[PDB]
Amino acid sequence: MVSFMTRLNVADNTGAKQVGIIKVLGSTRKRYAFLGDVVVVSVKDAIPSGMVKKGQVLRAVIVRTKKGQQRKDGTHLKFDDNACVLIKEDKSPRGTRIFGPVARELRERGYNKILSLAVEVV
């Protein structure tokens, strides 16, 4: 249940804490976001000593949802937070350390560089 301007966390080795969704890609009025989706984000909370600064428009992939989502198998993985990683306009991220396991519900979408550094592949 993530949408535009949903202030969401980041759990990767960067200098930011909270960012905001600006557009979830897809058909007009997506208005929903779940694991594996690629979104455009505006930085709203970042330390001045980080790799990126506040207000920079960048590309992120959400990896945690407090609501969770349903696997095709029927095993609904539910988190307690909403976090995302930041990518450098490709299938590779920009952080250098992942804090917490990453599920397999988004492995089929690609982005294998993120899952290779994941704490655990759920």
Binding site: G74, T75, L77, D80, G100, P101, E120
Partner: protein, 115 residues
């Protein structure tokens, strides 16, 4: 002819497991999933504690929650679903068959065990 609705259970007698390990919401367990990678069905041991156990025959599922990398993660698992191996290491003592507060009352991860 008149319907019985017991036939609903009757048609389900072909995808049942006879191990039937009974547990409670608040049990210290590990559920291992036999998940194919591409080849290599690997055994992912999902340890944790039970939160809810409710359903109707085949629809009986459960929720198992643990903390990994300082992140509390909870997942639903279906009992009758294959590739599911359940083990219980300590039978807890819970006053109710559901613990919603445990989602937030993560303190005192060890629970009182039944006698």
């Amino acid at each position: 002819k008149i319907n019985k609705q017991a036939l609903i259970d009757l048609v389900e007698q072909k995808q049942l497991k006879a191990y039937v390990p009974e547990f409670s919401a608040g049990d210290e367990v590990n559920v291992a999933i036999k998940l194919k990678e591409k080849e290599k069905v690997r055994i992912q041991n999902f340890t944790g504690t039970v939160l809810r156990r409710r359903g109707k025959g085949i629809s009986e599922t459960f929720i198992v929650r643990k903390t990994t990398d300082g992140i509390p993660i909870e997942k639903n698992f279906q009992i009758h679903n294959p590739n599911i191996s359940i083990e219980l290491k300590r039978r807890g003592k819970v006053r109710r068959a559901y613990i919603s507060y445990m989602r937030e009352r993560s303190g005192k991860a060890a629970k009182i065990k039944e006698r």
